Design a protein around this ligand. Structure first.
Ligand SMILES: [Ca+2]
Length: 223
């Protein structure tokens, strides 16, 4: 997250870190046994880390649980990035409490101008790299479909939206992929892609979770 702020420990209790000997992506806890992340985050050897603030120090409140299933959307396209969503089933259920809690799925899509909270342990620099110890947060609005398509012509599908700031300085970044975009208590987005980070006229692009609620429910019910 570039241009954000330190969330505060456990203030985003649905935020998870996906770890393979290092933090590589975020995710969102949607019930005690399932996490939503990005398809492009798929790999073998995923350990889900819940309850984290400083990802480099054991502080208390962490739960480390291996992924038992990692289900990339069958129609994920690694060139267009359409359908950039994955479900992870935990080997055991997480213990839910104030510091580890699920986030609700949307019942409807969010409108342009809706304010959201985006979070992660990704890069905090627009040029160069700096990775934080603690979780970072950014408040950001959803942009209009016309502004999003103007920024990224030919590249925005119905399963994507833009959020952030066209003036530069405030965005998600590498290391944030798979993490949450929460608006009015609902998980509306997944950190997906963008051109650079926090660059003028190049907002973040996010998977439009409201299009996948039925797919998520059906996939969880059958697994
Ligand atoms: Ca920790």
């Amino acid at each position: 997250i570039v241009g954000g702020y330190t969330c505060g420990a456990n203030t985003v209790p649905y935020q998870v870190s996906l770890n393979s000997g290092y933090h590589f992506c975020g995710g969102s806890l949607i019930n005690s046994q399932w996490v939503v992340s990005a398809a492009h985050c798929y790999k073998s050897g995923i350990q889900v880390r819940l309850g984290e603030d400083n990802i480099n120090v054991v502080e208390g409140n962490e739960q480390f649980i291996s992924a038992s299933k990692s289900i990339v959307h069958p129609s994920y396209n690694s060139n267009t990035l359409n359908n950039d969503i994955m479900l992870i089933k935990l080997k055991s259920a997480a213990s839910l409490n104030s510091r580890v809690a699920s986030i609700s799925l949307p019942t409807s899509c969010a409108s342009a101008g809706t304010q959201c909270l985006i979070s992660g342990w990704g890069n905090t620099k627009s040029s160069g790299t700096s990775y934080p110890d603690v979780l970072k947060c950014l408040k950001a609005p959803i942009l209009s479909d016309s502004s999003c398509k103007s920024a990224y012509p030919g590249q925005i599908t119905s399963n994507m939206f833009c959020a952030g700031y066209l003036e530069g300085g405030k965005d998600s970044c590498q290391g944030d992929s798979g993490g949450p975009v929460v608006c009015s208590g609902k998980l509306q987005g997944i950190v997906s892609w963008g051109s650079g980070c926090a660059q003028k006229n190049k907002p973040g692009v996010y998977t439009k979770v409201c299009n996948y609620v039925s797919w998520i429910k059906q996939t969880i019910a059958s697994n």
